[PDB]
Amino acid sequence: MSVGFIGAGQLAFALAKGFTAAGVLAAHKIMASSPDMDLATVSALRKMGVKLTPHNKETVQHSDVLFLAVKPHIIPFILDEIGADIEDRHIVVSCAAGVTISSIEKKLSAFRPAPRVIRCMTNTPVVVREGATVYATGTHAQVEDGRLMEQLLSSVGFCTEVEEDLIDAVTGLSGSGPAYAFTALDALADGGVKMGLPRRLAVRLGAQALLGAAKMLLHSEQHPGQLKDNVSSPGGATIHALHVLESGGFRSLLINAVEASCIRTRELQSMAD
Amino acid sequence: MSVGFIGAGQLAFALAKGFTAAGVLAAHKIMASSPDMDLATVSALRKMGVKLTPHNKETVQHSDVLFLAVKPHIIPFILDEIGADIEDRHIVVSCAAGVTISSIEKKLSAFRPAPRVIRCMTNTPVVVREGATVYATGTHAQVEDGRLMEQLLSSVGFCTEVEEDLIDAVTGLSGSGPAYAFTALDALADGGVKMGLPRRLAVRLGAQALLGAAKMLLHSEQHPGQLKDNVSSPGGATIHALHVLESGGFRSLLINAVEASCIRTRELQSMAD
Amino acid sequence: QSMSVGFIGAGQLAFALAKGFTAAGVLAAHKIMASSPDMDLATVSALRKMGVKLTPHNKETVQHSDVLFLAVKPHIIPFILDEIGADIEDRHIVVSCAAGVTISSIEKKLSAFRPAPRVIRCMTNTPVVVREGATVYATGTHAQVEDGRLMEQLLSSVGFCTEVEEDLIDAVTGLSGSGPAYAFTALDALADGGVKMGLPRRLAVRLGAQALLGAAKMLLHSEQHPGQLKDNVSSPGGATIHALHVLESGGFRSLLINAVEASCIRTRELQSMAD
Amino acid sequence: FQSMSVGFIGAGQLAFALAKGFTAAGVLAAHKIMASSPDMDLATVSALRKMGVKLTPHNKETVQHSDVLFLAVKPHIIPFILDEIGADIEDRHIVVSCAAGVTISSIEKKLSAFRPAPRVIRCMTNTPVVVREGATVYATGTHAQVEDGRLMEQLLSSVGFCTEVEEDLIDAVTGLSGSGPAYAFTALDALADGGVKMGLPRRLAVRLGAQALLGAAKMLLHSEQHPGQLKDNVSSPGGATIHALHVLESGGFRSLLINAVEASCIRTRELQSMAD
Numbered sequence A, B: 001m002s003v004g005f006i007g008a009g010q011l012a013f014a015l016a017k018g019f020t021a022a023g024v025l026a027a028h029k030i031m032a033s034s035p036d037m038d039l040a041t042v043s044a045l046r047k048m049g050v051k052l053t054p055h056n057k058e059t060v061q062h063s064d065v066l067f068l069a070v071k072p073h074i075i076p077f078i079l080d081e082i083g084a085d086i087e088d089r090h091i092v093v094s095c096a097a098g099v100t101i102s103s104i105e106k107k108l109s110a111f112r113p114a115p116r117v118i119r120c121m122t123n124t125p126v127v128v129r130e131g132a133t134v135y136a137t138g139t140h141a142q143v144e145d146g147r148l149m150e151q152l153l154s155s156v157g158f159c160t161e162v163e164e165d166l167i168d169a170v171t172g173l174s175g176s177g178p179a180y181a182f183t184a185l186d187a188l189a190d191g192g193v194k195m196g197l198p199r200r201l202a203v204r205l206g207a208q209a210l211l212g213a214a215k216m217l218l219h220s221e222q223h224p225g226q227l228k229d230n231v232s233s234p235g236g237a238t239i240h241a242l243h244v245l246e247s248g249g250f251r252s253l254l255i256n257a258v259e260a261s262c263i264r265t266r267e268l269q270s271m272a273d
Numbered sequence C: 001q002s003m004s005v006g007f008i009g010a011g012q013l014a015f016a017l018a019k020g021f022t023a024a025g026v027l028a029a030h031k032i033m034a035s036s037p038d039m040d041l042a043t044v045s046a047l048r049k050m051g052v053k054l055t056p057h058n059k060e061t062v063q064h065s066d067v068l069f070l071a072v073k074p075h076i077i078p079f080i081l082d083e084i085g086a087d088i089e090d091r092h093i094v095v096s097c098a099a100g101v102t103i104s105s106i107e108k109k110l111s112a113f114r115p116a117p118r119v120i121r122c123m124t125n126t127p128v129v130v131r132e133g134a135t136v137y138a139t140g141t142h143a144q145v146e147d148g149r150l151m152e153q154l155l156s157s158v159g160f161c162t163e164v165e166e167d168l169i170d171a172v173t174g175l176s177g178s179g180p181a182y183a184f185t186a187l188d189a190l191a192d193g194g195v196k197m198g199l200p201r202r203l204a205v206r207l208g209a210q211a212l213l214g215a216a217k218m219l220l221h222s223e224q225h226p227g228q229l230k231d232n233v234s235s236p237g238g239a240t241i242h243a244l245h246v247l248e249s250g251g252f253r254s255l256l257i258n259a260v261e262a263s264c265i266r267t268r269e270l271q272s273m274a275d
Numbered sequence D: 001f002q003s004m005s006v007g008f009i010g011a012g013q014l015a016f017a018l019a020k021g022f023t024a025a026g027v028l029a030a031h032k033i034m035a036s037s038p039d040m041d042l043a044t045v046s047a048l049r050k051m052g053v054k055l056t057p058h059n060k061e062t063v064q065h066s067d068v069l070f071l072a073v074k075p076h077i078i079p080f081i082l083d084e085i086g087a088d089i090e091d092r093h094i095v096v097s098c099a100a101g102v103t104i105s106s107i108e109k110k111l112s113a114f115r116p117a118p119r120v121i122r123c124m125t126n127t128p129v130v131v132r133e134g135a136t137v138y139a140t141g142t143h144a145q146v147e148d149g150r151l152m153e154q155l156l157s158s159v160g161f162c163t164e165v166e167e168d169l170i171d172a173v174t175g176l177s178g179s180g181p182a183y184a185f186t187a188l189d190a191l192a193d194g195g196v197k198m199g200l201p202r203r204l205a206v207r208l209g210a211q212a213l214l215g216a217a218k219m220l221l222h223s224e225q226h227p228g229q230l231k232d233n234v235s236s237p238g239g240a241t242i243h244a245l246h247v248l249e250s251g252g253f254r255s256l257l258i259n260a261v262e263a264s265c266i267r268t269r270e271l272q273s274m275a276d
Ligand SMILES: O=CN1CCC[C@H]1C(=O)O
Pocket: A231, A232, A233, A234, A235, A236, A237, A238, A239, B097, B171, B175, B176
């Protein structure tokens, strides 16, 4: 099979790099297109083996699965540019935040009547094949289309099917989650440096701490609260540090963040509607 | 070689499980001892293949490397119990928080004059072989002793040598860090549930988000701030969520936490001095 | 070259551009004119001693200028356009500096007189006066391609300048348009802190200003983003990382984000209020 | 001073920044500069090599081939350096400590155990010397000749602002201009986040924020006004800027920067007293 990318943002690069690292796709069977392709990401993808072109039309003509990794504002402009080139073989996979299956199908249906559409919310760590992906199938997607999507995106991380009305919430949690983590890792590093550690060592240890904790959770049947309980010894350093987190309302800020991101995602649909 | 554990807390179990999963030690070459061994962790370690005993003395007699995974309060009581049994072959590895190499050597030197002592700060994710470990070598540790320690603890995570005066700070960062992460994952899950996701899915996606983000950081040369910049698209959901984190002082709470844990660790030394 | 520049309005922004353009030597002699209803005598004196021609009639500036800067308050823009509208000619480039006011609304006023007014909208800031301004501009629907290039070269002589899409200008206003006032507020507070710890006020003002200029210049001359530079200069256990913690505890970052957003939102309100 | 050699004990960020500024200003030949450091596997050590600076692992070699000696090491290393090279300090030497908090008195006391009249200067500079826009103060020790202080004023003025102060002000200077660039990097990172939130590309938001701050600082430096008057001058009635100033005030923005200068100054004083 052949995969194409319309758009060349951080996400298209991350997916193409994950797919090739996963060995599920010969990078020569990947094509990308952009309006502005920087001399870096161009040389990044050209050194990767990904054929490029500045015309979205050529990418559609040589690709089977079409990932749309463009800003939600640009999706309808793209769809009306390539809709005449959409064939029956194509599966159109929108990664745009908020943009609904219905709006994409209604644009494409003006050309050929049964577009096969999938909507997905994934994230940048597909680049190291630890992405978190959900997807919903559209009204003309054959059953095999969803199984293919599940197989392909599982090669670069966790992936599961959801009902479309959960995707804005998923965007607030795992779509934006890596930025929450980078912010937390920056701050944990500042705390390590304050108490005397070299910056390099502080960044490394904070990151390894988070990675091991998350893997511990993924590999147990327990919820986060029981694990917190398990590792907080009576009277110890850790329970003292947890108290100062609670005193600033640490937990509510992360709830606030998921909510704010989910709500903004819904606005990005409405503004594009 | 043969490894022994004095104490059977969450840490001794986590290390023994990591070592056996790593295949660096035949679990029959691991011995553990505890004052109170619960019928679970006993059956956990007995099903694992680890020989047990309720006498610390037998564990010393059949082990080469001796991990002391007991509360800092109990260390000097242990040392005066086993000090007469310490032989020239033994390497004594203290995992206790705050307890200094000097205090351990001064206890053991009352018996035989050149105890080989190592101090380390590791964490529970060694159980899934993603620990974060630092260690400092004592005044009679041969050079090979530190290289052995580095090899053994690298089989269950990241490991590096540090000067002893950084270890209290490391405790505040990666020693306590998993609890910070479990707290954050609990709260991120509450945020996902608030916006409509099933609890199971919310826990899974938050954890995968954190793991992928941390792996992304470990696999780039960049610091956390540049990665935050890379994934925050103009006007998007993520930058909106980051603002609400900043408005609650999210960053300062994690700095507060590392500081509080490091300071409490120093108190645990002084109270034991 | 042979080109002439005119200012309608004589507030602090128009003064700052006239002074910066003359310090740049980018125009021939006597090529700058400015007009206003009630110009204060100091501004009259300063501009006159600068070589800038002055007149109370906006029509005179229009008639002797090729590039026309409108540096008046957004509320005043519709009245000026009604006054000068019949005097706008094909050769003219109308550059609006008013916050919020859209190219669309300017072209709509001017088109009732002549059909194809050449309009550019820009957001610049006061430090053009020392040739370190930050300027963005957007071109209107009847601007020739050479009009944007002319504007770029002109405003580059007094600072950074780049073209943007018009829908970014409100956000630029919140960042570099209001930026200098955020900096003056910060420098006043840093000086207060220096004085609290025992420095003379004069020394505290100078040191804080020099620290901010040096820091901004470091960033401009590196490929790095600010986060990496913060990491580079915060030594373990040191005085600087201790002070960064107290900034974080008060949510220092969130306040500057709040400021950019508040200025951008108010700028959007200044368009609609005119519309 | 086309004949004098400059030496750096320490080859870190400050040493690189000064050496780069000194050579960029043409005030010193790079081959007249020598630096020593504990470990050579530093990015700063490699950059010094490429600049033409001579590097050595032995502090005593630096001492023996330099006339002006910059101590660019952490405060708690100063007493260890002074014990190592004290016997090699000759009469021609000017010793310039850049360490935060460490007093002239403590440096002279160590060196005087060897030769009796060490010429010592204490300074507090900052990283922007690397683009020749540093902010520097210095105080002269009890055996410094009058030409030593004016030589110091001459050398450091080539990489930014420089003035002599009484020593009891240097801890305060550290909290203001020593730590100052870090306050600005934090402020620039947040302003860029603000620009991005409102729809600007990140690269453009970084560029515009930096240019705004540079131009503001230069405006202030080039007037006789204090910052308050300039804030008044650029804040038009009912406008976007004054609305934004109000939200800064509502979070106590001014008090946070006062808190910062104070916290850095207090920590600098602790760094001395710990070493004492
Ligand atoms: O209880 C957990 N931990 C991990 C670091 C040391 C110990 C403590 O909290 O004191």
